[PDB]
C-alpha cells in the first residue's frame, strides 16, 4: 500500500497536532504515544488512541499520495511548534517520515502499527449542546472532583441526562459542585446517567472546539452507556473517553432545602481579601464572622502571626461564625463566573451553599434555584 505524501498549511497542521497531543499519554506501551496521520480523499486526518481516550481531527491538505503512517506524538508536536510560517511538506520514505518547511528538514522514524489499537466507533449521538457552556460547565465542576485513585467514585464527573438538560456533578467528600445545562436530545425523552473520569473530560474541554455546539454520543434509550464510552463530536473533530465503572454518591440529599442565614458579596473583593488574610494560615483555616452589614475575615495563630480584615456584606438572618479551608473556598468562588456570590448557611458545622448571585428579610430562607451550586463543608472553629 502507497506512501503518504502531502502538503499542509503550518498553522492548521500545528494546531491539529497540538490538539491531539494534549490527549496522548506521557507510557507502559511506547507506541501508544504515537500519532496516526492518514491521507484520504477529503484531506488529512490526525489521531491518537491509547485504549482509553481517542482524539481525531480532520484538516485541509493537498494529498499528493494517499496512505497512513504512525509517528512519535511528542516529537511531531515539538517539531510543528517550531516550524517557520511556511508550507509543510510531509513525505513517507521507507522507515522514515520526511518533513520539510522552509530551509528546515526533519526525519522521524515510523512506528510499527501491529500493536497500535484502532480508533473505536462513537456510540449513537444522544444530543446537541453549546460547546462553550459545556466546556465551562466541566471546568466548573471538575474543581470539586477527587484526585486520588484510592477512591474511584470520587475521581469522576457524573453526567445525568434528561430530555431537557444535562446535569454535571463532582465531589471529593469536602465539596460538591453541580451544574445544569440546557441541551436538545436527538430522540426526545431520556433518563440516564454515566460516570466519566474528571481529569480526561476536563482535558477534552480545555483543548477546545472550533464550532458553536457539540454532540454528545452516549447511545439512546435503554442502550445509553452500553458501549462503555462517551463520545464528543464537533466540526472536524471527534473524541472518545472510556466511562468510569463506579457508583457516584447520592448527592441531592446534601443540598439544603432552606437556610437560617444568607449573605451576598462581590466575588473579586472577597477573593482578594481571603488571599490576603490566609497568608498567615499555617497549612489551615480562615474564619468568617457574619454580622449585619459586615464580614470579618480572620486567620492565623500567636506562634506564626494573625491577620484580619473587614468587608461590607449584604447579610440577613442568624449571625454566625464559620470556618473553611481557604483553598476550597477560593476554588468555589473562582468557579462561579459571576460578579457576586450568595452564601447559604445553616450552622457552623453544616455545609455552606455557594451560588451565583441574582438580582434580606428575617428567615428561614428557601434555597434559590440556580444552574450552578458549589457546596462546601466547613471546618470546626478552635
Amino acid at each position: 500500500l502507497t506512501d503518504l505524501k502531502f502538503r499542509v498549511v503550518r498553522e492548521d497542521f500545528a494546531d491539529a497536532v497540538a490538539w491531539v497531543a494534549r490527549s496522548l499519554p506521557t507510557p507502559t506501551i511506547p507506541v501508544l504515544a504515537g500519532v496516526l496521520l492518514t491521507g484520504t480523499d477529503e484531506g488529512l486526518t490526525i489521531s491518537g488512541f491509547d485504549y482509553e481516550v481517542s482524539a481525531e481531527v480532520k484538516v485541509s491538505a493537498e494529498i499528493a499520495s494517499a496512505g497512513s503512517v504512525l509517528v512519535s506524538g511528542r516529537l511531531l508536536s515539538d517539531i510543528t511548534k517550531a516550524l517557520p510560517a511556511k508550507p509543510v511538506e510531509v513525505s513517507v520514505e521507507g522507515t522514515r517520515v520526511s518533513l520539510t518547511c522552509g530551509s528546515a528538514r526533519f526525519s522521524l522514524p515510523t512506528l510499527a502499527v501491529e500493536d497500535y489499537p484502532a480508533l473505536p466507533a462513537l456510540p449513537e449521538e444522544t444530543g446537541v449542546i453549546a460547546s462553550d457552556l459545556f466546556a465551562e460547565a466541566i471546568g466548573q465542576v471538575a474543581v470539586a472532583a477527587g484526585r486520588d485513585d484510592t477512591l474511584p467514585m470520587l475521581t469522576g464527573i457524573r453526567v445525568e441526562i434528561s430530555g431537557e438538560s444535562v446535569v454535571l456533578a463532582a465531589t471529593d467528600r469536602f465539596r460538591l459542585a453541580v451544574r445544569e445545562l440546557t441541551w436538545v436530545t436527538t430522540a426526545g425523552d431520556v433518563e440516564a446517567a454515566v460516570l466519566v473520569p474528571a481529569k480526561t473530560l476536563a482535558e477534552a474541554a480545555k483543548a477546545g472546539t472550533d464550532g458553536n455546539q457539540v454532540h454528545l454520543a452516549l447511545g439512546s434509550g435503554a442502550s445509553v452507556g452500553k458501549d462503555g464510552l462517551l463520545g464528543i463530536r464537533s466540526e472536524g473533530k471527534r473524541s472518545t473517553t472510556r466511562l468510569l465503572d463506579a457508583e457516584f454518591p447520592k448527592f441531592r440529599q446534601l443540598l439544603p432545602a432552606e437556610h437560617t442565614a444568607v449573605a451576598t458579596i462581590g466575588v473579586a473583593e472577597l477573593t482578594e481579601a481571603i488571599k490576603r488574610v490566609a497568608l498567615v494560615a499555617d497549612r489551615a483555616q480562615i474564619r468568617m464572622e457574619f454580622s449585619d452589614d459586615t464580614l470579618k475575615l480572620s486567620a492565623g495563630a500567636d506562634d506564626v502571626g494573625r491577620a484580619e480584615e473587614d468587608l461590607p456584606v449584604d447579610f440577613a438572618g442568624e449571625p454566625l461564625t464559620i470556618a473553611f479551608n481557604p483553598t476550597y473556598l477560593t476554588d468555589g468562588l473562582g468557579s462561579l463566573h459571576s460578579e457576586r456570590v450568595t452564601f447559604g448557611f445553616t450552622t457552623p458545622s453544616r455545609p455552606a451553599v455557594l451560588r451565583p448571585a441574582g438580582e434580606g428579610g428575617s428567615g428561614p430562607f428557601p434555597a434559590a434555584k440556580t444552574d450552578y451550586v458549589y457546596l462546601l463543608m466547613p471546618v470546626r472553629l478552635p
Binding site: 454518591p249 446534601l254 463543608m377
Partner: peptide
C-alpha cells in the same frame, strides 16, 4: 474536618 454527610463515605 468533618466530611459532607455522604451516606456512606462521609
Amino acid at each position: 474536618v468533618p466530611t459532607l454527610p455522604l451516606v456512606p463515605x462521609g
